[PDB]
Paper text:
Class I histone deacetylases (HDACs) are enzymes involved in ‘epigenetic' gene regulation through controlling the acetylation state of lysine sidechains in histone tails. They act as the catalytic subunit of several large protein complexes that repress gene expression when targeted to the genome.
To understand how a substrate, such as the histone H4 tail, interacts with [name], we synthesized a novel inhibitor based on this peptide. Careful analysis of the orientation of the InsP6 molecule at the inter-molecular interface showed that the electron density clearly fits best when the inositol phosphate orientation is rotated by 120° relative to that seen in the HDAC3:SMRT:Ins(1,4,5,6)P4 complex. Several backbone amides in the H4K16 peptide make complementary polar contacts with the sidechain of D99 at the rim of the [name] active site. Comparison with the structure in the absence of the histone peptide suggests that this residue, and its immediate neighbours, undergo a conformation change on peptide binding.
Residue numbers in the entry:
A (entry chain B), E (entry chain B): 8 to 376
B (entry chain A), D (entry chain A): 165 to 228, 237 to 340
C (entry chain C), F (entry chain C): 14 to 18
Write the structure that this text describes.
């Protein structure tokens, strides 16, 4: 049974994005705490990630974008406003006390784990703080400041010829896509809502460019997708992907805003369905790096990643939530699982099979025997 | 809503290391381990130790409400501290228990919830009801001697409070 | 914005 | 006031055993050891264990007054039980601690003082003030369901009671 | 440093002699408990004594005296009254529930320890329950029912040619004397009040009989004896005794009613003085068997034997009494030691030296070179 | 008596 490494820094739950802001880092602390009380903590190798310095963040980002982040504060907020606009820091990506500390922990977790995978001293490595996939080389976007994912992947390329990147998050993983848009060594597959939704990118025809053409897979979706519909379009596509792209290390971003009843999301997935993807990936027995991502009904974010951690340990846990410091957060029910809503699935079988086929064609264009 | 191409967008792809080349990455600068998963201990023994770690804690706060102190001592901070005490002592139960009672005296771990004074708690419920969830101003004007990040940790712990009923 | 603050 | 001589007064003197003869005395029929004085343990560790044995006890009686429960758990019966738990487990701290928390659940030792009900205690203070220190009649007429020797043990423990003030 | 074995059965404190009766077994439990809290318990080998059966009690006593004791109860108290008078069970030796159990524990402790000494697996052995020295072959006397001392000594004779018996108790040790009155193998030395006092025996001229003549030493005394006077007459006499009687096992009865402020006693000794005797004996490095005996101001009985146990371990203890279940018993002071009273010492130097000399003559009559 | 009950 696969060996799992879990990365966590106690401080991460305590950093705060701002009044009225949906991204709430505290959800990782909630997970952490459930893991301890579900007895899972016990069963995996627990690491505190040292802070990632500007040194390794600039391995992808601008020497003067990170410089800006290292420097900016809420003190000198009116002094910098020039650079604030050039870098996207505001309306939905606030400045906030500790921001750079927050980035260092998220990035440290992902990088340390990548190394751990390259050093071949784990099979799976988990960092729920990480997964922040909207970030760009020279600007912040969609609550993401540093793209820990890219940096993580860049380290893996040192030992792995082909790195597969899978993205479940309801929002299209455009940061990780754009960063690797012109390379054939990394294939970016993404399943997301599309049409009057952020980030506006990742439609059927977004295939890549140059050497990276036919290496950026996307599955655009409308509202209300079931576990059943999602499963029936994830497994086929990913089996082909493995078949064709034949990777040697997987990085699964396990965005939890694709769950039902999310604050920002509008999909109808249950923890069970959501996790079935993690389990399917894990089954392909490749060095795997689970990251988190979005999720804005934190009670369920907690539930999800707690469950999905169990999946990486292939151990069973009861629906009965164990007592914990935040036990009272979990409704009148205090259960682990969520059920789907009456919400209407506007992804007709006809619409999913059209897209599926188009992708199967795209994937066939890769070399094989 | 557009994806861009160019030196200022894509990442420089890191070349695969030669069979002779080495990545040169110091692992101690990157991580520090907090729990080994393959221990000479069994679930029962760890479980047992956790009970003991809890008992000490209750007896600690008895030396300067019974159920209250026990619950206080049963909170996660105490448990986490119990799992580190094990790992720091190389999973030696007998050695780890000394750690918990260093010189015949027990150890107290109190989270921000339990640690704050009655009057600090009071201040917080005035600052919230007055500034909502604006935690930098809540400190500046109401709890300026506390560090922002302790006020955050407190907030979330306080949201589960019993006497706290914002719902109906 | 970016998403929905 | 007289010392007597004769077969019906003096003892028959037991003859010294031959260098080949053996006394023939089964030592297990005569004694059973309760504490070895040469232990692999140090004073500190025993002391520490005693603190732990006390903490469990307090946490035990928290699971069905803080200072009261701690004092209750600090009484001698609990300590004596702690010194036996050590010896029974061959002075293995790690093994002995399991004994104290058998299956994740702590153990309670209560002397007759603590163990009696409020109403039994009450009965006793009526029986004493009425029959003085006549403990067979105190049982017969007031606490007939208790064994005489438990009433004795209780008596002496009760004589140190705080609310007890026969002196001025 | 000498090895010590301590014998105790938890039940012994709980047996009760009767309303208004001075002998209170609870004083042993008080000692036991101090020993634990003074940290001394820790330092010696602790044994629970199994019950001594009629088998070994009849090794000295009547087959029908023990039979009587095994049988008698407070139930059949009016049925037996015939035998009650023949055996002395009444006015100051009551019948009481558990009586025979009590005897078995007191005797078991002494016998087990004797064996332990013969088996050469201890240097000192301590049984505070024991020491009950007024008992006779066919009758109870002075609160004593079974003479554990004799039985103990009888076992020691199996390995020891000469057994010395020393008796500090304020009352003359006539049970142990009478039992060995005609033998030269056991020498019984006793220091006690005399003249209108119990048991009426043990004056200067009580020397023994037959083979046992010049082997029963006695020191008669009046009221108010100091530590200073006592020390100055104990050491000289005992050094001669060792010199002459040359024993190979000592049995010291450490009666605590010779202390100051006893309920029944009228001597003016402090724990310190009293113990100086135990220390002096111990110094002669012989297999030693410490027993208790009388003592009727139990707070001090507790103090004494606790202290004297330390002496056998030659460890220091503070005057500060440690907390314990019966801590509140010990006055406003909560100290270990007692000081002597203004009470007048009617043992003039002239009177002590007259007696001393007479005894030195008696002891010279023994064989030597 | 024997001693002093
Ligand atoms: O404390 P915050 O991080 O600001 O989040 C709270 C919190 O949501 P979470 O419990 O999911 O963190 C409230 O939930 P309760 O405290 O009531 O359980 C929620 O209230 P509702 O769940 O009733 O919406 C409230 O939302 P609102 O401010 O709209 O009342 C929302 O604050 P934010 O909306 O600022 O995140
Ligand atoms: O409980 P018991 O075994 O019968 O002994 C008690 C007890 O004496 P101890 O404390 O030494 O056992 C009393 O002492 P306190 O309870 O007052 O501390 C004492 O009272 P005094 O010390 O004030 O004399 C009293 O004696 P009395 O009955 O004369 O009041 C005496 O009972 P006995 O005399 O029956 O032994
Ligand atoms: K996605
Ligand atoms: K690509
Ligand atoms: K004497
Ligand atoms: K003799
Ligand atoms: Zn998202
Ligand atoms: Zn006496």
């Amino acid at each position: 049974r696969r060996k799992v490494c879990y990365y966590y820094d106690g401080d991460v739950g305590n950093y705060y994005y701002g009044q009225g802001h949906p991204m709430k880092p505290h959800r990782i602390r909630m997970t952490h705490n459930l893991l301890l009380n579900y007895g899972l903590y016990r069963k995996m190798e627990i690491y505190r990630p040292h802070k990632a310095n500007a040194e390794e963040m600039t391995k992808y980002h601008s020497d003067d974008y990170i410089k800006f982040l290292r420097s900016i504060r809420p003190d000198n907020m009116s002094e910098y406003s020039k650079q604030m606009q050039r870098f996207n820091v505001g309306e939905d990506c606030p400045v906030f006390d500790g921001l750079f500390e927050f980035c260092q922990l998220s990035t440290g977790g992902s990088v340390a784990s990548a190394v751990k995978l390259n050093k071949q001293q784990t099979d799976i490595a988990v960092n729920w703080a990480g997964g922040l996939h909207h970030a760009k080389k020279s600007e912040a976007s969609g609550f993401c400041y540093v793209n820990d994912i890219v940096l993580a992947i860049l380290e893996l390329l040192k030992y792995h010829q082909r790195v597969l990147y899978i993205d479940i998050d309801i929002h299209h993983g455009d940061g990780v896509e754009e960063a690797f848009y012109t390379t054939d060594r990394v294939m970016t597959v993404s399943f997301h809502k599309y049409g009057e939704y952020f980030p506006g990118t990742g439609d059927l025809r977004d295939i890549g460019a140059g050497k990276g053409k036919y290496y950026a897979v996307n599955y655009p979706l409308r509202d209300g997708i079931d576990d059943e519909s999602y499963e029936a379009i994830f497994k086929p596509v990913m089996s082909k992907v493995m078949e064709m792209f034949q990777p040697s290390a997987v990085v699964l971003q396990c965005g939890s805003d694709s769950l039902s009843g999310d604050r920002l999301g509008c999909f109808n997935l249950t923890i069970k369905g959501h996790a079935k993807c993690v389990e399917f990936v894990k089954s392909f027995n490749l060095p795997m790096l689970m990251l988190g991502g979005g999720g804005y009904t934190i009670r369920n974010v907690a539930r999800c990643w707690t469950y999905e951690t169990a999946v990486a340990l292939d151990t069973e846990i009861p629906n009965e939530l164990p007592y914990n410091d935040y036990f009272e957060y979990f409704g009148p029910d205090f259960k682990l699982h969520i059920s789907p809503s009456n919400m209407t699935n506007q992804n007709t079988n006809e619409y999913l099979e059209k897209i599926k086929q188009r992708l199967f064609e795209n994937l066939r264009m890769l070399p094989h025997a | 809503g557009e994806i861009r191409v160019g030196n200022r967008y894509q990442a420089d792809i890191t070349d695969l290391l030669k069979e002779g080349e080495e990545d040169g990455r110091d692992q101690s600068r990157l991580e520090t381990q907090v729990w080994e998963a393959h221990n000479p201990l069994t679930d029962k023994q760890i479980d047992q130790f956790l009970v003991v770690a809890r008992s000490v804690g209750t007896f600690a706060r008895a030396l300067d409400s019974l159920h209250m102190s026990a619950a206080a001592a049963s909170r996660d901070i105490t448990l986490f501290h119990a799992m580190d005490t094990l790992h720091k002592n190389i999973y030696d139960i007998s050695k780890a228990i000394s750690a918990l009672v260093p010189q015949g005296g027990p150890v107290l771990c109190r989270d921000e919830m339990e640690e704050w004074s009655a009057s600090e708690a009071n201040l917080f419920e005035e600052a919230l009801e007055k500034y909502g969830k604006d935690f930098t101003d809540i400190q500046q004007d109401f709890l300026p001697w506390k560090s922002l990040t302790s006020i955050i940790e407190y907030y979330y712990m306080w949201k589960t409070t019993d006497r706290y009923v914002q719902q109906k | 914005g970016a998403x929905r603050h």
